[PDB]
Ligand binder design. Structure first.
Ligand SMILES: [C]O[C]1[C]([O])[C]([C]OP([O])(=O)OP([O])(=O)OP([O])(=O)O[C][C]2O[C](N3=[C]N([C])C4=C3N=C([N])[N]C4=O)[C]([O])[C]2[O])O[C]1N1[C]=NC2=C1N=[C]N=C2[N]
Ligand SMILES: Nc1ncnc2c1ncn2[C@@H]1O[C@H](CSCC[C@H](N)C(=O)O)[C@@H](O)[C@H]1O
Ligand SMILES: [Zn+2]
Ligand SMILES: [Zn+2]
Lengths: 300, 115
């Protein structure tokens, strides 16, 4: 019955295991979903990711701030940004970024390594589709990767509003131990596999409602193995069924409250509202961002 | 005294037989919407497709300045409905056709203001 869903999330019993990391080998590896005429993979992917997110307790305030990393593509456009804007309430502030130049529907776009990206502001929702193609050059044991996953883990701890949520793309080899550990700083977490990319080890690590502190301790090395175990023993039929019904697609405008709070004010009652998607905590000042620029004169 | 008519150039390249700009981002949608030309979310009716606007605008795609004296973009950040019969070239269509200031539909592809 999974085929009529947008995709499939890691069942809790696999999260609870203490598996060891195996190579990932999927029955349908390299199979491709049939897509609706003229529809790009990344539109279908992001659509199903948003459809899955409609089922969670996302905070959705007025003047929502969303930021999308790795939104470029080899096409020079941002298919996933287009879906996020469609999904998101009209007027949602949407910043995106990628190392390579692309044209976007985002309110602002920064080009460059994400580590040159800076903002004073906290955010309500962070999306990362960042992936290093050199990850394909597997020449050793599959260890936790740093690089952009280091920036991301920092951005979340520094710039994610309490009650905010994240969706961060990983694969068998594109993953990071601390990101998993940080998944436990959310009220709830999963690994979600879109049905149109079910023949991939790709998942989106989704943290639901940030709590700024660990709710549960997660060994990230162990959980990535648990994730591979799950994928290795649970083949997922490619399916694009859920792309056809867009009638309930738009993110509910919950009009969620926003409050600037100290760390002394975060009690168990406040914490419970965070965890229910009923509260966001952060400043509501103007949103300013920047990209660092290295200056050099090469002449002589 | 010199600027470049980007619009004319693509209109001539298409006329010569050139292949229209590809990789315009088509949205999934209900296809039961208003049918209006340019909108803040997909509004395709049964006879249209909805695309993200940036990807359909010639000035954004070619990295060139926009005709507005402000450089503002009519399409970026928005969605454009394209007659399904022309969705092979959304950049051509948007450039050549004009939107009714009154009802919001494409003049000649929905605008029934005249009668
Ligand atoms: C936009 O979205 C893109 C994708 O949709 C998504 C990833 O999709 P993927 O390609 O399927 O990834 P994967 O093969 O499932 O995992 P991996 O970490 O690349 O595996 C490393 C290496 O290990 C092997 N491996 C892995 N697995 C799971 C196997 C298998 N071998 C088998 N016989 N059976 C299997 O089950 C194989 O040799 C791999 O190469 O990431 C995006 N993306 C990918 N590449 C690029 C890119 N974006 C930009 N530029 C890119 N160059
Ligand atoms: N360190 C880094 N900083 C910024 N972007 C990075 C990065 N490493 C990889 N990326 C970007 O991750 C992207 C993967 S392809 C992304 C597809 C796009 N999100 C869509 O929605 O269609 C690449 O464009 C790549 O430039
Ligand atoms: Zn433009
Ligand atoms: Zn009219």
């Amino acid at each position: 019955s999974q085929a009529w869903q947008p995709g499939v999330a890691m069942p809790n019993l696999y999260k609870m295991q203490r598996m060891l990391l195996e190579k990932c080998d999927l029955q349908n590896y390299g199979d491709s979903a049939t897509l609706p005429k003229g529809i790009m993979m990344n539109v279908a992917k992001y659509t199903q990711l948003c459809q899955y997110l409609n089922t969670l307790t996302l905070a959705v305030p007025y003047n929502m701030r969303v930021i999308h990393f790795g939104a470029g593509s080899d096409k020079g456009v941002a298919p996933g940004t287009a879906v996020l804007r469609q999904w998101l309430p009209t007027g949602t502030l949407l910043v995106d970024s990628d190392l390579n130049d692309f044209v976007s529907d985002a309110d602002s776009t920064l080009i460059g390594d994400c580590a040159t990206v800076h903002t004073a502001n906290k955010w309500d929702l962070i999306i990362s589709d960042m992936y290093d193609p050199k990850t394909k050059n597997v020449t050793k044991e599959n260890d936790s990767k740093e690089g952009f996953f280091t920036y991301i883990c920092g951005f979340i701890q520094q710039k994610l509003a309490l009650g905010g949520s994240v969706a961060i793309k990983i694969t068998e080899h594109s993953w990071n131990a601390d990101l998993y550990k940080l998944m436990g700083h959310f009220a709830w977490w999963t690994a979600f596999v879109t049905n149109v990319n079910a023949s991939s080890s790709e998942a989106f690590l989704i943290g639901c409602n940030y709590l700024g502190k660990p709710r549960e301790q997660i060994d990230g090395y162990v959980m990535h193995a648990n994730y591979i175990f799950w994928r290795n023993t649970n083949p997922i039929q490619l399916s694009s069924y859920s792309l056809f019904d867009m009638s309930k697609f738009p993110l509910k405008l919950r009009g969620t409250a926003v409050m600037s709070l100290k760390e002394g004010q975060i009690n168990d009652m406040i914490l419970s509202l965070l965890s229910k998607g009923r509260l966001i905590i952060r400043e509501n000042n103007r949103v300013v961002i920047s990209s660092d620029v290295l200056v050099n004169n090469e002449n002589l | 005294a010199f600027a470049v008519d980007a619009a004319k150039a693509y209109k001539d390249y298409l006329a010569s037989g050139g292949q229209p700009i590809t990789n315009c981002v088509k949205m999934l949608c209900t296809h039961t919407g208003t049918g209006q030309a340019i909108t803040v979310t997909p509004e395709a009716n049964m006879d249209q497709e909805s695309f993200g606007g940036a990807s359909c605008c010639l000035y954004c795609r070619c990295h060139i300045d926009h005709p507005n004296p402000k450089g503002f973009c009519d399409l970026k950040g928005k969605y454009v409905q394209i007659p399904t019969t022309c969705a092979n070239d959304p950049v051509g269509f948007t450039l050549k056709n004009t939107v009714c200031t009154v009802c919001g539909m494409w003049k000649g592809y929905g605008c029934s203001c005249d009668q």
